[PDB]
Amino acid sequence: STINAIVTDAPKGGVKYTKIDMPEPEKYEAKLKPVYIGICGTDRGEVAGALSFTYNPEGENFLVLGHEALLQVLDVSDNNYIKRGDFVVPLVRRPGKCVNCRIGRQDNCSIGDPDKHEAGITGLHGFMRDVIYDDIQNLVKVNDPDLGKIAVLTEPLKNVMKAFEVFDVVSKRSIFQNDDSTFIGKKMVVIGSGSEAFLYSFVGKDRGFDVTMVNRHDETENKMKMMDDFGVGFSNYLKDMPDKIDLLVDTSGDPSTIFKFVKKVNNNGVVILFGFNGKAPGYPVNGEDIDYIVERNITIAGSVDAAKIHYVQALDSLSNWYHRHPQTIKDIITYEAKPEETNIFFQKPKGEIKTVIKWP
Amino acid sequence: STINAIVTDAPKGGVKYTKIDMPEPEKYEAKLKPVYIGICGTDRGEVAGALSFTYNPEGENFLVLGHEALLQVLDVSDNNYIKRGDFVVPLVRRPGKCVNCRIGRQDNCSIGDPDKHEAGITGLHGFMRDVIYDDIQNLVKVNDPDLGKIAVLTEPLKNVMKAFEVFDVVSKRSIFQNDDSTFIGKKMVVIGSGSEAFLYSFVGKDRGFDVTMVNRHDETENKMKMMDDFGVGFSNYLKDMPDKIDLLVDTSGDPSTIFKFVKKVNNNGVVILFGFNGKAPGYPVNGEDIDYIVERNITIAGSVDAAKIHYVQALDSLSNWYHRHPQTIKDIITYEAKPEETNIFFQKPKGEIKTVIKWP
Amino acid sequence: STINAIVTDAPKGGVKYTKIDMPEPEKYEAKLKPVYIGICGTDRGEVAGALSFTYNPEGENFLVLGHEALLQVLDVSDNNYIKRGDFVVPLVRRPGKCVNCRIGRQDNCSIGDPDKHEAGITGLHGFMRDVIYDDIQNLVKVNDPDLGKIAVLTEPLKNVMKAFEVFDVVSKRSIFQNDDSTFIGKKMVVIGSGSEAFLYSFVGKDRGFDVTMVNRHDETENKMKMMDDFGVGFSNYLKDMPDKIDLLVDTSGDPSTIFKFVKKVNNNGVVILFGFNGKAPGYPVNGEDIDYIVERNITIAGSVDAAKIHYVQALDSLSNWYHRHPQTIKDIITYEAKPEETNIFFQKPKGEIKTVIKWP
Amino acid sequence: STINAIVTDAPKGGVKYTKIDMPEPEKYEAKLKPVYIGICGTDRGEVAGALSFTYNPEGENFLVLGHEALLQVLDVSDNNYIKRGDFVVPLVRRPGKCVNCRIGRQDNCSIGDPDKHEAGITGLHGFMRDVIYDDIQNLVKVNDPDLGKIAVLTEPLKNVMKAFEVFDVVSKRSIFQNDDSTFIGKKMVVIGSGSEAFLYSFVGKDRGFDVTMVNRHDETENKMKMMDDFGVGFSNYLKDMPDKIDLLVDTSGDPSTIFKFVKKVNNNGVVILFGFNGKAPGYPVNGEDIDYIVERNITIAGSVDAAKIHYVQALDSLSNWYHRHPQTIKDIITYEAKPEETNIFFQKPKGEIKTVIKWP
Numbered sequence A, B, C, D: 001s002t003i004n005a006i007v008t009d010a011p012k013g014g015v016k017y018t019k020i021d022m023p024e025p026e027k028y029e030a031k032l033k034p035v036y037i038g039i040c041g042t043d044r045g046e047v048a049g050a051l052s053f054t055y056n057p058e059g060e061n062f063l064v065l066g067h068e069a070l071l072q073v074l075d076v077s078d079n080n081y082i083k084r085g086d087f088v089v090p091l092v093r094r095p096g097k098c099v100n101c102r103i104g105r106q107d108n109c110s111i112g113d114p115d116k117h118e119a120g121i122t123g124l125h126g127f128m129r130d131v132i133y134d135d136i137q138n139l140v141k142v143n144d145p146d147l148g149k150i151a152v153l154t155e156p157l158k159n160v161m162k163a164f165e166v167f168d169v170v171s172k173r174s175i176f177q178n179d180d181s182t183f184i185g186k187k188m189v190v191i192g193s194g195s196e197a198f199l200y201s202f203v204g205k206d207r208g209f210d211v212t213m214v215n216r217h218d219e220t221e222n223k224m225k226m227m228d229d230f231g232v233g234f235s236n237y238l239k240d241m242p243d244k245i246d247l248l249v250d251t252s253g254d255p256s257t258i259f260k261f262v263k264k265v266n267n268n269g270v271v272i273l274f275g276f277n278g279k280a281p282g283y284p285v286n287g288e289d290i291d292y293i294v295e296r297n298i299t300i301a302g303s304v305d306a307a308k309i310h311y312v313q314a315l316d317s318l319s320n321w322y323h324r325h326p327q328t329i330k331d332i333i334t335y336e337a338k339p340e341e342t343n344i345f346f347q348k349p350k351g352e353i354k355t356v357i358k359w360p
């Protein structure tokens, strides 16, 4: 078929909503179309030419962008789990052959590129196109019919879930809990006030932390209310610096900010590094900074992507939260765009949290 | 009563072999004398007045030095475990009241000072003194009569054992091993060529790694032959940069060296921060460094101290090693000084690996 | 002070809804009264005189009953957690001094009786008594107002939460998940159709298993439609005997049943032993039964009670379940009885799953 | 070519030392002969026709016996690890395709037969034959040259190493250690006094348990002296049954003995099921037995086979054991037979711990 798609020339950049030749494989398990597609900094970086690791699939001269997808099943081979008209979230990362990839933890690929591949990013077409072919195993079923568009948030939230898995694994190094066995009063601070930070914060809340998002500027009454609704605090760190931190999560990617907060981490504290900012400036880490980490048995863990199981978990949390605080969750999606509006990739709609593309 | 002791005034500095008065209780669990006491950069740090976290015990104006000890039991209340004559290594770190401290994991204390205390470092006298009283529970019996003074390596080595427990905990985040279940071919790089570096290296070979110590200068042939007898490599990184590192351990405390090597760590790799040097110059860590860690799901863990179980493990390894490689082990101890030679806190013996005090 | 209270004389037993002398003890942080109190087979066994291990507090002729409780606070000290008016679930098990109690894991008491004590079973007065004094540490706050009397279920659920924590720990022996990383299609069978079974089935369902409860007879369309509403299957194992089980949980306590179902467990299966029936006759375990277990690497884990953190989790679960299936959870509590009505300790309201007691 | 081999007809039984044709396959990485092959209850069970699971390889009328082997490399493709003349221990279990097999954890195969296969047991020729072809990856190199024939104990010891890994996983359900962090004074009881019991006991001692083997008769003086050389105790439980057991390992396969000792296990105790005897008679387990397990948070784990990493751990233990207790370890091997002494598969020569065939 000829079909519509939003494409880049990876890694060169640019973006055009335009038509393309894309033939059916004789061999397919499932055929789908896109309902919603979220966009994040990674897409904007792709478009902007800022990411040297991205590439078009083999023997092609464009890449269909889009990896934060909510899709609907048009057609599907015989199976016990999905049927026509079922909504699904498609896996971003797909496995290679490495000891991790082969048990479905391509999120911890031991090789990196080119063992694993990511839809819309590294050698595999994304989801901003009229038709999509895939294998059933790569699709996670949306089981709550009430969520609708909220399900598009699955992809950003699964990364949060894997990060908390990493938290759970490394915090086993000691007794992290209070001596009553609980997390009551343990302090989570999240660097940043964006999409990922919100999702960190809500999960933090469900695990029983006291949570505080932080930024180098005040926030909008909109965001403030959303946080208030979840029982999440906020602080401008130029005005009030949190200390005595048990769980530090960075979404900024900024070193100066990371290390100033690390020097507030308690004994047996855990630092999750999540944010990318290759442009971020150097911050000098000195011997006293190293000593601070050592003497406190602090763990700094970098986390990227997630496994299928974490997509399932993300859907379950999106449901729980939608049924308890619908206005807040709905407010996460702050603009819906038509596929023509390709200027979303260079410019942020006003007061953005999560921008998405409604397809028809 | 009056006894000989080697003392300082923490944190100001100074060292004197000298006469002091110390209570001699008539009620005690155990009474001991020192046979050998080891020294390490912490001892040298305290005496230069370079460590501002050290203090003397409450209501005193000196601090007996020495935390790496082998002691002999003079007398002991009746018990199932030790008797008069036996050799023992005393716990350096003594528990407070925290959740970690109360299960004998004071190495992981949730509070720090003043919950936990360290013999010879923080508010508790050390072992460089003619007489010592202690509880039996704080002593680890040497079960092997052929070890002799090698048992004095128990204390620096127990730190290694806990760092490896930390490795084992955090490496559970992914499959770290080969797809045959082993560590065959996994690569460990230890920054430094000093005593802790050797002991890390030896435990790593036992684990199954291929190991390379590294430093910014060439090494004496004494050390080179010691490495060779254990199958440990060596390389001077200003000439051959090791690459593709699965486990990295730093004993330097130096930021620039640490981060230089962090950029060679593979996916799912682990970095143990161990060494500390508060005067080490700042290294600028930038956005791309952070990214490197994030994208590879790397863990950077600070480790300090160990529990009693790690002393027991350390003695078991010392004795596995000794009945396999007698001479290279003996060769770890490079100078048996006399209590009065207190210039050793200022001045390193030529070719120092481990200097020990031989106690009268 | 005189108060109305239902009590017994353990281990002999028998119930009367009397009044008794309960003086206001010296040191106490909270004064409570019972709103609702659940009951179960342990409360009935206690009345019969069925249970060897129960007994009365030191030097008292009687024992207040009830361990499944929702309670309201009447007065409390200045604190950041609870106030006049908040409703709470109280800890059943209160810790002794062993390595596990002292970290708040008295559910894993290393000593057993008399280190730990259970309110209403082992030397500590239960909660069916007009006034209750307690420390704030032993109280769990209900943070959801819509829950009302649902929160009575916190105690039976919290045992289920601990059990699934045991499953999580022990199933690490091997990769339990599918090669996609998920639990999709893994088969949980819960032996029995009672209240704990329902609570296991719902949690199973949230963990991603295909769940079937089973029994030796068909079940009330009342029960069958709750199962159906959650997506839990049912089967009577005289008509159909389920096969290829990955997680087998017993609420029956009956050996013959446990072991017939153990013989259907797959490789790497986990068996949770939960229910206890001291009267159940013997079933003959032979050589081949053992071999079945050995060659399949199966784990059989007994589980009892739970820690505070699991009371919190059980509360979060009820709030999530309530807000998504309000009608079905509500239906779990089948009868609100009055203290006066003490037939309940001998007889079941028709097709009763949970029987609550409303307090005057 | 025509070679000698010891063969059975599985599962029918029978044994004979005879000639067979072993063609040189087209592609092989390694060519080996046997130096020693250990025999165990499984080999005798096969030859007796008593094992239903065993089968001949595809399209053959016989099955070469022997799975406990030490081999010498006659020829091998060039590689980094083994060369001509090296001694190796080969893997018994070879992987299939399931999620555990493909990470080298076929010891935990999720399918059972015919996914995994066992040399000498299940559709794959054993090692009692003059020539053997294999892949390098399936061979574990003997690095210590003084071990000699002691290395043949690798295969029964790696089973123990895996069972201790299973112990390490399951005992994380609570704090199993003392409040000093150690295992000092924890009690391990091993049901049985054969070679597996001894290897369990030696590892138990190295783990820091107090260990006692037990049987239903007194033991010979050789065995008693060996226990004594390692500090392992013994008891005829007809006369004196150990109580207060923290870790119970069974090597008998006998239900009656198992369940009787299960009733001595402490809170948080672990029972490893290891031995198997399909012929052993039923023992009735009642409601009270089950409740004992539940109320004590006891785990009962069946354990079979091992992974490659556990063959390597086994060889490191056998070296550590050999360089400390030379004659004791040599004495585990109690009869060296000739291949034609097929009588050893039917009669336990007098004093047996481990019988081996020295291959001509």
Ligand SMILES: Nc1ncnc2c1ncn2[C@@H]1O[C@H](COP(=O)(O)OP(=O)([O-])OC[C@H]2O[C@@H]([n+]3cccc(C(=O)O)c3)[C@H](O)[C@@H]2O)[C@@H](O)[C@H]1OP(=O)(O)O
Pocket (backbone or CB within 6 Å): A040, A041, A042, A156, A159, A191, A192, A193, A194, A195, A196, A197, A214, A215, A216, A251, A252, A253, A254, A257, A273, A274, A275, A276, A277, A303, A304, A305, B294
């Ligand atoms: N110095 C600072 N101090 C405090 N806050 C600062 C600072 N500098 C920047 N920020 C804030 O960081 C937050 C980042 O959110 P986002 O809008 O980039 O979008 P997002 O969706 O929330 O994602 C955050 C990160 O996740 C990265 N990501 C995306 C996908 C996967 C993974 C992974 O590791 O798995 C990581 C993504 O590329 C990005 O770096 C915003 O609130 C920024 O504020 P402002 O701009 O409003 O001032």
Ligand SMILES: Nc1ncnc2c1ncn2[C@@H]1O[C@H](COP(=O)(O)OP(=O)([O-])OC[C@H]2O[C@@H]([n+]3cccc(C(=O)O)c3)[C@H](O)[C@@H]2O)[C@@H](O)[C@H]1OP(=O)(O)O
Pocket (backbone or CB within 6 Å): A294, B040, B041, B042, B156, B159, B191, B192, B193, B194, B195, B196, B197, B214, B215, B216, B251, B252, B253, B254, B257, B273, B274, B275, B276, B277, B303, B304, B305
């Ligand atoms: N830039 C560099 N690049 C490569 N190597 C370098 C560099 N700078 C210094 N080194 C080498 O680091 C090693 C330090 O060893 P050490 O013998 O001074 O003392 P140790 O007993 O082996 O331990 C060293 C560190 O461990 C620390 N420590 C000790 C005990 C316990 C713990 C703990 O966390 O539990 C930590 C102690 O505070 C100290 O900082 C030597 O080989 C140094 O070589 P050279 O300058 O001599 O040629």
Ligand SMILES: Nc1ncnc2c1ncn2[C@@H]1O[C@H](COP(=O)(O)OP(=O)([O-])OC[C@H]2O[C@@H]([n+]3cccc(C(=O)O)c3)[C@H](O)[C@@H]2O)[C@@H](O)[C@H]1OP(=O)(O)O
Pocket (backbone or CB within 6 Å): C040, C041, C042, C156, C159, C191, C192, C193, C194, C195, C196, C197, C214, C215, C216, C251, C252, C253, C254, C257, C273, C274, C275, C276, C277, C303, C304, C305, D294
């Ligand atoms: N042979 C059998 N085959 C299949 N099903 C059978 C068989 N025998 C009895 N049952 C069913 O077992 C269930 C028992 O649960 P329950 O509602 O009496 O009470 P609950 O509150 O749900 O608690 C059940 C068990 O948990 C025990 N418990 C309770 C709380 C905590 C813990 C712990 O380990 O921490 C243990 C308690 O002592 C009791 O044994 C009912 O559905 C019974 O059926 P029917 O009566 O409909 O015929």
Ligand SMILES: Nc1ncnc2c1ncn2[C@@H]1O[C@H](COP(=O)(O)OP(=O)([O-])OC[C@H]2O[C@@H]([n+]3cccc(C(=O)O)c3)[C@H](O)[C@@H]2O)[C@@H](O)[C@H]1OP(=O)(O)O
Pocket (backbone or CB within 6 Å): C294, D040, D041, D042, D159, D191, D192, D193, D194, D195, D196, D197, D214, D215, D216, D251, D252, D253, D254, D257, D273, D274, D275, D276, D277, D303, D304, D305, D353
């Ligand atoms: N009622 C009893 N009470 C106390 N002891 C009893 C009782 N009945 C029999 N025994 C003793 O248990 C031991 C069996 O040892 P073995 O050397 O014949 O066998 P092995 O070569 O050491 O192998 C141990 C077990 O593991 C099985 N196995 C072997 C290898 C691996 C695995 C696995 O799960 O991975 C399992 C093998 O078939 C056997 O069942 C002997 O000491 C027997 O004593 P007696 O005969 O002197 O009177």
Ligand SMILES: OC[C@H]1O[C@@H](O)[C@H](O)[C@@H](O)[C@@H]1O
Pocket (backbone or CB within 6 Å): A040, A042, A092, A093, A118, A121, A155, A159, A304, A305, A306, B295
């Ligand atoms: O490294 C590329 C990563 O980009 C992120 O924005 C996606 O959420 C991940 O799925 C992906 O693996």
Ligand SMILES: OC[C@H]1O[C@@H](O)[C@H](O)[C@@H](O)[C@@H]1O
Pocket (backbone or CB within 6 Å): B040, B042, B067, B092, B093, B118, B121, B155, B156, B159, B304, B305, B306
């Ligand atoms: O300096 C503090 C640390 O010093 C090390 O030298 C000792 O080995 C540790 O036990 C101690 O916690």
Ligand SMILES: OC[C@H]1O[C@@H](O)[C@H](O)[C@@H](O)[C@@H]1O
Pocket (backbone or CB within 6 Å): C040, C042, C067, C092, C093, C118, C155, C156, C159, C304, C305, C306
């Ligand atoms: O029998 C012991 C257990 O019985 C159960 O019904 C209770 O929920 C537990 O808290 C109690 O300790």
Ligand SMILES: OC[C@H]1O[C@@H](O)[C@H](O)[C@@H](O)[C@@H]1O
Pocket (backbone or CB within 6 Å): C295, D040, D042, D067, D092, D093, D118, D121, D155, D156, D159, D304, D305, D306
């Ligand atoms: O199933 C038979 C088991 O028997 C034991 O003798 C072997 O050591 C195992 O490798 C084998 O898996």
Ligand SMILES: [Zn+2]
Pocket (backbone or CB within 6 Å): A039, A040, A041, A042, A043, A067, A068
């Ligand atoms: Zn994204």
Ligand SMILES: [Zn+2]
Pocket (backbone or CB within 6 Å): A095, A096, A097, A098, A099, A100, A101, A102, A106, A109, A110, A111, A112, A115, A116
């Ligand atoms: Zn991969």
Ligand SMILES: [Zn+2]
Pocket (backbone or CB within 6 Å): B039, B040, B041, B042, B043, B068, B156
């Ligand atoms: Zn030191």
Ligand SMILES: [Zn+2]
Pocket (backbone or CB within 6 Å): B095, B096, B097, B098, B099, B100, B101, B102, B106, B108, B109, B110, B111, B112, B115, B116
């Ligand atoms: Zn502490």
Ligand SMILES: [Zn+2]
Pocket (backbone or CB within 6 Å): C039, C040, C041, C042, C043, C067, C068, C156
């Ligand atoms: Zn109950």
Ligand SMILES: [Zn+2]
Pocket (backbone or CB within 6 Å): C095, C096, C097, C098, C099, C100, C101, C102, C106, C108, C109, C110, C111, C112, C115, C116
């Ligand atoms: Zn206790």
Ligand SMILES: [Zn+2]
Pocket (backbone or CB within 6 Å): D039, D040, D041, D042, D043, D067, D068, D156
């Ligand atoms: Zn065998």
Ligand SMILES: [Zn+2]
Pocket (backbone or CB within 6 Å): D095, D096, D097, D098, D099, D100, D101, D106, D108, D109, D110, D111, D112, D115, D116
């Ligand atoms: Zn398999």
